[PDB]
Amino acid sequence: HHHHHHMVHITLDRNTANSWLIISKDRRQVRMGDTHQNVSDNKERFSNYPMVLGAQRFSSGKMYWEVDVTQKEAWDLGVCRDSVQRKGQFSLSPENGFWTIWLWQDSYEAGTSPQTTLHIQVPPCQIGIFVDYEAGVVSFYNITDHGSLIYTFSECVFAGPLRPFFNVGFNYSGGNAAPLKLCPL
Numbered sequence: 353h354h355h356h357h358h359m360v361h362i363t364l365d366r367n368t369a370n371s372w373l374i375i376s377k378d379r380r381q382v383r384m385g386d387t388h389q390n391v392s393d394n395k396e397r398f399s400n401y402p403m404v405l406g407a408q409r410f411s412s413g414k415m416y417w418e419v420d421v422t423q424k425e426a427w428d429l430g431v432c433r434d435s436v437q438r439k440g441q442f443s444l445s446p447e448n449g450f451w452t453i454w455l456w457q458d459s460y461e462a463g464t465s466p467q468t469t470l471h472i473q474v475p476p477c478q479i480g481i482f483v484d485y486e487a488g489v490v491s492f493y494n495i496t497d498h499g500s501l502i503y504t505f506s507e508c509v510f511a512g513p514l515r516p517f518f519n520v521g522f523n524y525s526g527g528n529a530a531p532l533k534l535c536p537l
């Protein structure tokens with residue numbers, strides 16, 4: 353792909369994080385802690401899942417960023433509306449304000465409703481995410497496989513400002529402790 357020149361510097365918003373997440377000093381990495389991280393509760397925190405938002409809000413233009421997923425067994429990545437539900441149980445779908453892909457149990461899927469099987473021959477260590485606000489597009493790229501396309505959501509109805517979206521996943525297995533990292537430009 354040729355989207356690299358739309359690169360944006362994403363940082364994580366601590367206030368939105370599930371209370372078990374540990375965000376690095378530079379706000380560029382996040383991982384699952386083994387306990388509650390001793391923060392107060394607030395209406396922005398994702399309560400049920402190990403999720404956090406980027407601080408940046410996008411309402412126009414073209415944006416690109418990359419995320420390192422090395423080692424991980426489970427994660428979700430993409431964008432979401434600023435007004436997505438934070439509390440209780442919900443599915444990741446465009447109807448609920450999410451445009452995401454994930455890894456779960458050795459398969460990759462796009463967060464459509466119902467979910468869509470992805471076809472990835474080279475398991476990615478870094479994912480590129482491209483948003484074209486005006487066109488209504490969210491695309492995912494396999495940086496490990498020379499930038500090959502993973503998935504395109506088109507005809508998106510964003511219906512609000514967008515925020516970068518992250519889920520580090522649970523670590524029931526002891527094999528999913530590794531962080532998500534925002535990769536340098």
Ligand SMILES: CC(=O)N1CCN(C(N)=O)CC1
Pocket residue numbers: 383423529530531
């Ligand atoms: C600081 C710490 O607990 N860890 C465990 C998770 N890590 C990993 N899997 O890469 C980083 C080191």
